[PDB]
Amino acid sequence: VTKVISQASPVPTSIPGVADLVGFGTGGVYIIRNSLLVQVVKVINNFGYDAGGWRTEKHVRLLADTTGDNQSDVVGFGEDGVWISTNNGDNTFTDPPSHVLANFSYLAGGWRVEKHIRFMADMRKTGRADIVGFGEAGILISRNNGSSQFAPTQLALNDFAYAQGWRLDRHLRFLGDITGNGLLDVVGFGENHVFVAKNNGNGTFQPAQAVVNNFCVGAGGWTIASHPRVIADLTGDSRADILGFGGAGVYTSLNNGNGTFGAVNLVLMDFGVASGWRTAKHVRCVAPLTSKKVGDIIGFGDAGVYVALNNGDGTFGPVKRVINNFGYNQGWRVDKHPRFVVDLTGDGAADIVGFGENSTWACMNKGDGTFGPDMKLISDDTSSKGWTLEKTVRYAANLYA
Ligand SMILES: CC(=O)N[C@@H]1[C@@H](O)[C@H](O)[C@@H](CO)O[C@H]1O
Numbered sequence: 431v432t433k434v435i436s437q438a439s440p441v442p443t444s445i446p447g448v449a450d451l452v453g454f455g456t457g458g459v460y461i462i463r464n465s466l467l468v469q470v471v472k473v474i475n476n477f478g479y480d481a482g483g484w485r486t487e488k489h490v491r492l493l494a495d496t497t498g499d500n501q502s503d504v505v506g507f508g509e510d511g512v513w514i515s516t517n518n519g520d521n522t523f524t525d526p527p528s529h530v531l532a533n534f535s536y537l538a539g540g541w542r543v544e545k546h547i548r549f550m551a552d553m554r555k556t557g558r559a560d561i562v563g564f565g566e567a568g569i570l571i572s573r574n575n576g577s578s579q580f581a582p583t584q585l586a587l588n589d590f591a592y593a594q595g596w597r598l599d600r601h602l603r604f605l606g607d608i609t610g611n612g613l614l615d616v617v618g619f620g621e622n623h624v625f626v627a628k629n630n631g632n633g634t635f636q637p638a639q640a641v642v643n644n645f646c647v648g649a650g651g652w653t654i655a656s657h658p659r660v661i662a663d664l665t666g667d668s669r670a671d672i673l674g675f676g677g678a679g680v681y682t683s684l685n686n687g688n689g690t691f692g693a694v695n696l697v698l699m700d701f702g703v704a705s706g707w708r709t710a711k712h713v714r715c716v717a718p719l720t721s722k723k724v725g726d727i728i729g730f731g732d733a734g735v736y737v738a739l740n741n742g743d744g745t746f747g748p749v750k751r752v753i754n755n756f757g758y759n760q761g762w763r764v765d766k767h768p769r770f771v772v773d774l775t776g777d778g779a780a781d782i783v784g785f786g787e788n789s790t791w792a793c794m795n796k797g798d799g800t801f802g803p804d805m806k807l808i809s810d811d812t813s814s815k816g817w818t819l820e821k822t823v824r825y826a827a828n829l830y831a
């Protein structure tokens with residue numbers, strides 16, 4: 431499946447891949463390298479609640495390859511600027527980090543978690559991640575010129591920002607390739623339309639185009655509170671399609687190939703409000719779980735994990751409960767226990783990992799969207815050891831492969 435960057439998952443993982451685990455703890459940054467010999471390693475005495483004053487409410491902490499060597503670096507949008515610790519290649523990182531740009535931050539640029547969105551993305555196919563912010567006047571990009579040299583911001587597009595009415599309480603913004611050229615374009619679920627903007631390849635976009643009169647708060651009644659939406663390749667043409675978890679169930683609009691979109695269809699009467707699904711208590715994802723390399727549906731519900739497998743064309747097979755765990759009825763809580771659907775084995779079929787009450791747990795995908803037994807990986811990065819949502823950040827991320 432293709433690289434999609436979203437508000438919900440700003441650190442994309444690779445398909446295929448062997449994702450590592452990263453924790454921005456109170457004392458700093460810790461990693462669990464995906465390997466046969468499992469352990470927790472502290473790598474930076476920074477980017478933490480008690481290690482530099484990092485706060486979920488004011489700052490953004492991410493992983494992205496900022497150098498082009500295919501290793502992920504630690505990036506923090508802090509109080510006064512953007513701070514980077516680079517991956518040394520051997521499960522260590524530079525410490526202290528370096529401040530590379532006095533912008534995209536609370537006091538330098540006036541950026542706010544409540545109003546603005548900050549991502550890291552290779553926007554020009556350089557192999558390096560540029561800074562991309564949806565701010566006040568539009569989308570601002572700082573070009574990564576290599577060797578920690580970040581160009582001052584340029585207004586990539588005068589849209590998808592606070593001045594054009596975009597709000598985190600009402601709308602969704604994504605980066606994803608909707609044309610097939612390998613460049614990340616902008617997809618925005620606005621007030622009355624899904625808009626797209628095509629990437630020019632040089633740090634700017636074409637003007638936005640309304641492509642679907644649906645999936646929005648003012649078109650079809652789609653709320654952030656009840657109806658999560660994603661973009662993902664549902665068909666295998668490498669272009670992002672639209673999928674929504676609506677009232678009745680799952681709605682899709684398939685990309686025509688060029689970033690225009692087809693009809694809106696209800697393709698599955700499950701995973702919606704009508705079948706009991708709730709943003710407050712459940713996790714719904716789209717990720718490849720089989721050899722077809724298209725988006726399948728995963729849902730951490732009450733009784734456990736439910737999957738519907740894509741037939742290969744954006745329609746789905748029956749819903750099956752594949753694991754009687756990671757669900758609400760086994761004590762998993764959206765506000766305490768992060769759960770991710772990511773490739774941990776390198777075969778292209780996404781696995782399940784969860785940071786539980788006492789242990790990190792995983793289940794291996796057998797390659798066909800069925801799973802093995804719940805495996806206990808390690809008793810760290812968990813609630814019981816002080817890792818809370820309010821004070822810490824945890825990701826699955828490809829640090830190397
Ligand atoms: C939240 C934040 O920006 N924290 C930074 C910290 O990472 C850095 O070590 C320090 C250097 O003086 O400056 C603080 O502002």
Ligand SMILES: CC(=O)N[C@@H]1[C@@H](O)[C@H](O)[C@@H](CO)O[C@H]1O
Pocket residue numbers: 533534538539540541542546564565566567568570583
């Ligand atoms: C929150 C926000 O968008 N702040 C930007 C700032 O990052 C940029 O340096 C400046 C340049 O004019 O424009 C502001 O609007």
Ligand SMILES: CC(=O)N[C@@H]1[C@@H](O)[C@H](O)[C@@H](CO)O[C@H]1O
Pocket residue numbers: 589590594595596597601619620621622623625638
């Ligand atoms: C929040 C939202 O949807 N804002 C859009 C804006 O992006 C678009 O450029 C404008 C002109 O069509 O229409 C507004 O409603």
Ligand SMILES: CC(=O)N[C@@H]1[C@@H](O)[C@H](O)[C@@H](CO)O[C@H]1O
Pocket residue numbers: 644645649650651652653657675676677678679681694
């Ligand atoms: C939030 C939601 O599910 N909205 C759907 C909308 O997308 C669909 O177009 C309409 C008629 O089919 O039914 C609404 O309930």
Ligand SMILES: CC(=O)N[C@@H]1[C@@H](O)[C@H](O)[C@@H](CO)O[C@H]1O
Pocket residue numbers: 700701705706707708712731732733736749
């Ligand atoms: C919120 C939730 O878990 N809903 C599930 C639904 O997906 C499933 O189709 C049904 C039959 O197993 O069981 C419900 O409890």
Ligand SMILES: CC(=O)N[C@@H]1[C@@H](O)[C@H](O)[C@@H](CO)O[C@H]1O
Pocket residue numbers: 755756760761762763767785786787788789
């Ligand atoms: C939220 C959480 O961690 N729940 C786990 C559950 O998945 C596991 O089946 C059980 C028995 O080991 O232990 C619980 O603590």
Ligand code: NA
Pocket residue numbers: 494495496497498499500501502503517
């Ligand atoms: Na790198």
Ligand code: NA
Pocket residue numbers: 497499501516517518519
């Ligand atoms: Na490196």
Ligand code: NA
Pocket residue numbers: 488489490507508509534535536537541
């Ligand atoms: Na900040």
Ligand code: NA
Pocket residue numbers: 606607608609610611612613614615629
């Ligand atoms: Na594109």
Ligand code: NA
Pocket residue numbers: 662663664665666667668669670671685
């Ligand atoms: Na597609």
Ligand code: NA
Pocket residue numbers: 772773774775776777778779780781795
């Ligand atoms: Na896998």
